[PDB]
Amino acid sequence: PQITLWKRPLVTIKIGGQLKEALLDTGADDTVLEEMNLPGRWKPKMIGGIGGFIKVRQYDQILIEICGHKAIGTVLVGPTPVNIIGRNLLTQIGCTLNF
Amino acid sequence: PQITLWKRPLVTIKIGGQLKEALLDTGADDTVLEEMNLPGRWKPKMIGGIGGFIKVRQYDQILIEICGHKAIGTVLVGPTPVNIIGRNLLTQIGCTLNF
Ligand SMILES: CCC(CC)CN(C[C@@H](O)[C@H](Cc1ccccc1)NC(=O)O[C@H]1CO[C@H]2OCC[C@H]21)S(=O)(=O)c1ccc([C@H](O)CO)cc1
Numbered sequence: 001p002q003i004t005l006w007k008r009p010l011v012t013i014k015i016g017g018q019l020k021e022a023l024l025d026t027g028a029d030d031t032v033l034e035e036m037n038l039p040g041r042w043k044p045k046m047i048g049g050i051g052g053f054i055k056v057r058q059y060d061q062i063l064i065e066i067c068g069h070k071a072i073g074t075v076l077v078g079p080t081p082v083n084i085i086g087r088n089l090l091t092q093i094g095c096t097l098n099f
Numbered sequence: 100p101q102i103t104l105w106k107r108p109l110v111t112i113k114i115g116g117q118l119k120e121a122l123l124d125t126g127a128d129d130t131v132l133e134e135m136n137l138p139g140r141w142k143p144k145m146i147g148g149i150g151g152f153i154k155v156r157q158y159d160q161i162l163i164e165i166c167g168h169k170a171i172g173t174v175l176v177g178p179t180p181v182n183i184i185g186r187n188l189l190t191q192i193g194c195t196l197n198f
Contacts, residue, residue, distance in 0.1 A: 001197070001198070002195050002196070002197050003195060003196040003197070004190070004195050005125060005186040005189045005190050005194060005195065005196070006186075006190060008126075008128070008186070009125055009126075009196055023125070023126045024125060024126075024196055025124070025125055025126030026104055026108050026123055026124060026125045026126070026196075027108075027122055027123070027124025027125065027126045027127055027183055028126060029107070032149070047149070048149075048150060048180055049148040049149035049150050049180060050131065050146065050147065050148020050149065050150065050151075050152075050153055050179050050180065051147060051148040051149065051150035051151030051152055051153055052150030052151050053150050054149060054150055067198075069198065080149055081147075081149070082126075084126060084149075087104040087105070087107070090104045090198075091103070091104050091105050093198050094198045095104060095196060095197070095198040096101050096102055096103055096104065096196070096197050096198065097101070097102040097104070097108055097123060097125070097194055097195075097196060097197075098100075098101050098102070098194070098195055098196075098197050099100070099166075099168065099189075099192050099193045099194040099195070
């Protein structure tokens, strides 16, 4: 589909057997999701934006479904105010900017 | 143009007569640029990111050219980690997400 940007580009995603709302964010290299208790091993990481840094947990090879498009990649879990779908997964679903 | 997301969507912008590089950021409501000198008056404003809130200078009705497309809107100036073009201007240049 085509998503205009009058409002936030929020879409439903499926991760860890759960449905969630997340931004399609071309400004994020990686995917950052709100706190959730995923199984498996992880690595600590700190990520910075406006206001400073937050501590997150890096999970690798996580399966996410975005608007029925399947993708698998790194997911960072931490106290983010919004679920953020970054470029590492946007490319996998064939997402582009156009103007 | 059509922009793939295997690299950061960085573009050249023209603001206040000066060229700069900025990131097309669909996850940003607003446009925020690093500290710079801009003509005209401004108002103190607050904006929040992934790591908290910062103080910015709000310039309204500013001429800004993005990858050859002209826009006139609000530009926030403050300690953002990188220059970001937000939806308030992406809409003006007719930018959409497509997959
Ligand atoms: C300048 C920050 C960007 C460029 C460095 C990167 N950011 C993504 C932007 O899209 C954020 C997304 C966001 C939306 C709402 C609340 C919190 C975050 N938008 C945003 O700050 O917009 C400003 C302005 O407009 C206003 O509307 C929204 C809030 C206000 S990030 O989240 O901080 C992030 C950092 C590092 C990674 C690495 O890849 C991981 O390793 C991945 C993501």
